[PDB]
Amino acid sequence: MSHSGAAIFEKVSGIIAINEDVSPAELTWRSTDGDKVHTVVLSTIDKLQATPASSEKMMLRLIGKVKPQRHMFSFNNRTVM
Amino acid sequence: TINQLEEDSKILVLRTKKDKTPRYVWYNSGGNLKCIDEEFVKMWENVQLPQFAEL
Amino acid sequence: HNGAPHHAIEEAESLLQFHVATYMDNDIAGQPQALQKSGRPVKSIRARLKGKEGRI
Amino acid sequence: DRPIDDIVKNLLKFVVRGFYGGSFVLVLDAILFHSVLAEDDLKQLLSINKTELGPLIARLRSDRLISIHKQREYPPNSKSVERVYYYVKYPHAIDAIKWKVHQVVQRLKDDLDKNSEPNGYMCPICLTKYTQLEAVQLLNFDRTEFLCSLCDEPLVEDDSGKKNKEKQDKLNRLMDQIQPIIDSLKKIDDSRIEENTFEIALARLIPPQNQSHAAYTYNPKKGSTM
Amino acid sequence: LKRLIEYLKTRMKVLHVISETPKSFLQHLKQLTFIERKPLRFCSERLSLLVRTLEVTEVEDFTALKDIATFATLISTYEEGFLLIIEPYEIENAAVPNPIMRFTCLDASIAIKPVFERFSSVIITSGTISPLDMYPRMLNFKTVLQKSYAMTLAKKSFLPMIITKGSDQVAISSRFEIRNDPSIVRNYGSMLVEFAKITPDGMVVFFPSYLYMESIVSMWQT
Amino acid sequence: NTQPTIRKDGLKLVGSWKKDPELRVLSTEEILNIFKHISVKDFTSLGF
Amino acid sequence: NKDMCPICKTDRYLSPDVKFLVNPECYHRICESCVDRIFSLGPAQCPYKGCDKILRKNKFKTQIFDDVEVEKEVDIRKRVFNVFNKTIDDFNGDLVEYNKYLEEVEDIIYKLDHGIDVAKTEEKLRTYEEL
Amino acid sequence: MFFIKDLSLNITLHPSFFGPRMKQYLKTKLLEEVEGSCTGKFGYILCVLDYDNIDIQRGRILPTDGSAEFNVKYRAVVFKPFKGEVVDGTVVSCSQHGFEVQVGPMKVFVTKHLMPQDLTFNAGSNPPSYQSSEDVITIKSRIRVKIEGCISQVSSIHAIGSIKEDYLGAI
Ligand SMILES: [Zn+2]
Ligand SMILES: [Zn+2]
Numbered sequence: 001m002s003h004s005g006a007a008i009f010e011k012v013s014g015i016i017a018i019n020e021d022v023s024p025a026e027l028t029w030r031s032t033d034g035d036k037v038h039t040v041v042l043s044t045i046d047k048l049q050a051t052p053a054s055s056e057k058m059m060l061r062l063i064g065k066v067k068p069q070r071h072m073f074s075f076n077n078r079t080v081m
Numbered sequence: 082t083i084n085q086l087e088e089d090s091k092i093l094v095l096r097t098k099k100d101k102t103p104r105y106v107w108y109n110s111g112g113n114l115k116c117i118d119e120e121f122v123k124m125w126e127n128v129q130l131p132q133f134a135e136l
Numbered sequence: 137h138n139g140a141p142h143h144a145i146e147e148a149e150s151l152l153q154f155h156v157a158t159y160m161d162n163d164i165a166g167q168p169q170a171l172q173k174s175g176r177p178v179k180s181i182r183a184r185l186k187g188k189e190g191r192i
Numbered sequence: 193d194r195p196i197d198d199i200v201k202n203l204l205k206f207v208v209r210g211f212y213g214g215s216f217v218l219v220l221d222a223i224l225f226h227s228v229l230a231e232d233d234l235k236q237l238l239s240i241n242k243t244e245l246g247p248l249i250a251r252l253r254s255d256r257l258i259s260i261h262k263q264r265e266y267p268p269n270s271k272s273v274e275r276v277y278y279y280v281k282y283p284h285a286i287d288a289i290k291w292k293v294h295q296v297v298q299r300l301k302d303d304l305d306k307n308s309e310p311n312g313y314m315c316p317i318c319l320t321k322y323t324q325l326e327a328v329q330l331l332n333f334d335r336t337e338f339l340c341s342l343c344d345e346p347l348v349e350d351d352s353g354k355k356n357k358e359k360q361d362k363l364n365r366l367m368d369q370i371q372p373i374i375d376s377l378k379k380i381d382d383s384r385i386e387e388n389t390f391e392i393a394l395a396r397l398i399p400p401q402n403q404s405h406a407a408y409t410y411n412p413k414k415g416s417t418m
Numbered sequence: 419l420k421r422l423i424e425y426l427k428t429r430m431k432v433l434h435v436i437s438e439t440p441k442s443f444l445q446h447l448k449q450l451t452f453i454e455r456k457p458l459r460f461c462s463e464r465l466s467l468l469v470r471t472l473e474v475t476e477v478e479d480f481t482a483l484k485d486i487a488t489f490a491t492l493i494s495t496y497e498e499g500f501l502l503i504i505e506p507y508e509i510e511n512a513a514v515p516n517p518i519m520r521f522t523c524l525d526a527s528i529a530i531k532p533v534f535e536r537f538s539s540v541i542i543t544s545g546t547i548s549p550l551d552m553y554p555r556m557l558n559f560k561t562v563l564q565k566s567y568a569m570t571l572a573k574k575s576f577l578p579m580i581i582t583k584g585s586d587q588v589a590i591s592s593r594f595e596i597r598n599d600p601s602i603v604r605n606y607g608s609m610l611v612e613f614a615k616i617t618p619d620g621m622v623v624f625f626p627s628y629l630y631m632e633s634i635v636s637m638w639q640t
Numbered sequence: 641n642t643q644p645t646i647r648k649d650g651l652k653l654v655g656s657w658k659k660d661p662e663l664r665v666l667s668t669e670e671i672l673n674i675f676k677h678i679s680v681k682d683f684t685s686l687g688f
Numbered sequence: 689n690k691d692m693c694p695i696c697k698t699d700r701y702l703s704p705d706v707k708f709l710v711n712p713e714c715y716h717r718i719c720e721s722c723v724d725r726i727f728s729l730g731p732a733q734c735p736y737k738g739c740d741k742i743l744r745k746n747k748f749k750t751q752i753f754d755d756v757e758v759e760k761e762v763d764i765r766k767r768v769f770n771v772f773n774k775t776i777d778d779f780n781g782d783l784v785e786y787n788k789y790l791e792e793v794e795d796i797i798y799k800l801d802h803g804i805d806v807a808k809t810e811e812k813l814r815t816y817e818e819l
Numbered sequence: 820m821f822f823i824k825d826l827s828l829n830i831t832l833h834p835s836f837f838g839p840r841m842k843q844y845l846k847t848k849l850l851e852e853v854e855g856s857c858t859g860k861f862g863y864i865l866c867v868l869d870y871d872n873i874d875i876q877r878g879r880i881l882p883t884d885g886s887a888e889f890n891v892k893y894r895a896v897v898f899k900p901f902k903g904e905v906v907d908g909t910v911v912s913c914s915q916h917g918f919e920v921q922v923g924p925m926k927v928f929v930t931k932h933l934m935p936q937d938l939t940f941n942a943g944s945n946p947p948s949y950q951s952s953e954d955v956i957t958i959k960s961r962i963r964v965k966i967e968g969c970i971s972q973v974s975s976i977h978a979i980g981s982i983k984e985d986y987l988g989a990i
């Protein structure tokens with residue numbers, strides 16, 4: 001349950017799962033209607049960004065390494081983040 | 082085939098009030114569709130329930 | 137029973153409440169009066185009670 | 193996830209196949225599958241009409257099965273509308289099912305109690321019922337028949353009391369069909385029920401489609417003292 | 419024996435402590451069933467004879483028969499110096515009630531009485547028994563002489579101490595209600611660490627109860 | 641809890657809760673439930 | 689059943705209030721409400737499919753022992769021992785004849801319990817209680 | 820069944836009976852409409868005791884019809900039935916609906932659903948009665964009946980009887 005959560009990826013609803021068993025691990029994003037699928041490689045991770053709980057705007061961002069690749073992750077529940 | 086799946090209570094089916102024709106099918110995840118008789122259903126319909134704080 | 141938008145429910149119960157009131161008192165301040173087919177106001181029970189030709 | 197959640201889901205499914213029709217089954221299965229749903233999402237999933245969901249939402253609100261949430265959010269185009277959200281309160285739902293089944297069995301036990309009373313009498317002209325007590329005062333000078341007061345016609349025997357075995361068969365045929373509900377409530381009482389809400393039921397949401405007009409983020413307000 | 423089992427099963431359904439003499443129990447027996455003391459006084463003998471004469475290959479399922487025959491004979495033959503304790507919570511930490519019965523021997527001199535009756539010359543000896551006259555009180559027997567010896571030393575071979583307070587002079591106690599006191603447990607840990615720093619070869623450490631070690635070593639390991 | 645100010649607007653009662661105003665129409669069934677929850681001594685003091 | 693009635697079929701979950709009322713004649717568990725319903729108007733048969741013995745309302749009692757055959761033995765030895773009142777002093781200290789009498793009364797309890805020689809033992813019981 | 824009670828009765832004394840001797844007129848007019856009179860408040864009142872002295876108050880002249888209104892307090896024996904009561908009696912009439920048993924001044928009806936199933940109706944026999952395999956219940960026959968329900972109007976009392984209970988019926 002800690003590795004699973006519904007998310008938003010470029011204004012598109014989806015889910016987030018951790019492909020932890022394979023080395024390297026992956027953050028797989030799956031569209032709920034089967035439009036597109038996205039995965040995140042864990043080797044190119046530098047900084048990881050979060051919003052505070054007091055803020056109503058709810059956003060998660062990932063900073064990569066070599067023009068870094070920045071991905072948006074909007075969630076629904078706070079315990080999920 | 083949808084009719085026999087309905088009478089076996091394996092799928093959930095939507096039919097018109099005009100006639101018994103299927104368009105949309107769902108899966109019967111729970112128990113049997115016809116498990117309570119009509120008289121028991123209607124006297125379940127007759128009975129009411131108390132308000133919030135009583136329970 | 138048949139399901140309705142909420143404002144239909146408040147509209148219907150307000151109509152019922154108004155009919156109860158004008159049955160019980162047709163002369164209400166700030167309120168319209170129920171009228172007969174001839175257009176005369178409906179003689180409520182309070183009208184039959186109070187007044188010169190009232191009950192008392 | 194939680195086994196108790198599976199037990200209450202199975203209980204809600206069993207009662208909706210039992211005491212409800214197919215469309216109520218579809219609505220409750222949509223609620224138990226997608227934990228938090230709105231009106232537009234339900235219309236998209238079920239292809240149901242407003243005049244068709246009206247009886248459905250009215251019945252599951254009258255039977256206290258679906259908790260409704262009155263929340264208005266602000267879309268970026270500033271066309272804010274009062275959207276409604278449908279979720280379930282597990283302890284309230286199981287208490288409602290408990291009270292309904294208890295009052296059902298109490299009513300049918302009272303029916304079995306009152307059907308042991310004798311047949312009584314009834315006048316076919318006036319169509320008025322008579323118990324055993326007032327049949328004696330309607331007895332004539334011939335000491336044979338019971339003459340009606342208004343119709344002046346002899347009374348006939350009502351067909352009540354011979355259905356006492358029919359009521360017993362109805363009682364047993366109801367109770368062998370309710371035993372899984374009894375077992376589910378026993379398993380619930382042997383466990384603990386966590387009282388959820390909209391913010392808690394949003395933890396286990398399943399998205400109906402990609403593009404839902406109704407947002408699932410709660411907007412707090414200051415100064416509301418409801 | 420089956421109605422013995424059912425009578426005792428009936429006797430467990432109670433919500434409070436039952437503390438009655440064997441005489442009261444047998445009177446309740448004789449008024450609830452029709453079963454006398456004398457047939458119960460041959461219960462174990464009859465059951466053993468029946469099991470022998472049946473020549474059963476396995477006796478795994480008949481051990482509770484030994485239990486009930488033992489109970490019947492014990493509570494029938496004995497009426498003074500004994501008591502029956504029926505209590506509903508065999509452990510008070512259990513969520514579900516588990517009723518218990520305890521048939522106890524109030525008089526400890528009973529089991530030692532035929533030993534004194536049969537034999538003449540008896541030596542009672544412990545390395546650490548005190549007081550010497552305590553035991554002729556708990557056991558109905560008369561000694562011919564009791565004396566305690568003071569063992570003499572060229573140099574004092576043993577050094578006994580009493581510690582009443584920790585390093586911070588906080589009084590230490592091992593009452594079961596204050597077993598979770600962080601100050602007392604911390605003082606205990608401090609003295610045992612210092613002793614382990616200063617003890618050459620080996621220690622034995624004694625506490626009152628098993629749950630006491632469980633809680634207190636859970637706390638020091640934490 | 642915060643008891644709102646009640647005023648009549650025709651044949652219905654509206655209650656304005658204070659702002660830390662939250663104004664809404666009070667349903668008759670709600671008032672009936674509240675009046676049922678009023679104890680005997682409470683309306684006895686009120687003259688009922 | 690173990691928890692719930694056979695006629696009204698009320699569990700202890702939903703109706704914890706009725707009591708373990710059992711026949712001393714046909715030995716069937718039934719709730720208190722079924723006794724107050726069926727047998728208040730008059731005596732009737734056993735309400736199940738298979739037993740139909742005529743039983744009274746006032747003959748119903750609570751169940752002390754949860755077993756049925758044991759309770760049957762209990763009630764028949766109350767029904768027998770009330771007239772079978774012979775002690776050691778009644779035998780004037782004769783142990784052998786007292787033991788034989790105890791064996792005899794135990795045997796007739798067994799015969800009424802299994803219901804095999806019920807007629808002859810019942811006849812002997814009535815002839816003994818008449819004297 | 821039979822009780823004794825201290826009752827107060829309100830009597831309309833007509834002005835035509837304002838003779839010198841109203842006491843025995845008042846006692847007499849007490850004594851027609853009480854003896855055998857049925858009241859649901861106290862049952863069938865049968866006989867008035869203590870006739871020599873009866874408490875007679877000072878009478879009310881009603882302001883419209885001039886009649887004297889006396890609140891006479893008297894002591895009398897009454898027959899007030901109840902439900903759950905078993906009594907003896909004799910059958911005075913019978914029918915397919917059931918039979919009427921006379922208990923005192925009262926005709927308690929036993930309905931056709933309230934005998935044991937052994938009894939059945941035979942209208943061919945004269946008189947038409949209820950016959951069973953072990954006993955017959957005819958007119959003017961001794962029978963013990965239990966009353967399960969009594970309805971009491973302002974001036975009439977009717978009762979429901981049965982013989983389904985054990986140790987009932989003919990003695
Ligand atoms: Zn009529
Ligand atoms: Zn029952």
Ligand SMILES: [Zn+2]
Binds near residue numbers: 735740
């Ligand atoms: Zn039976």
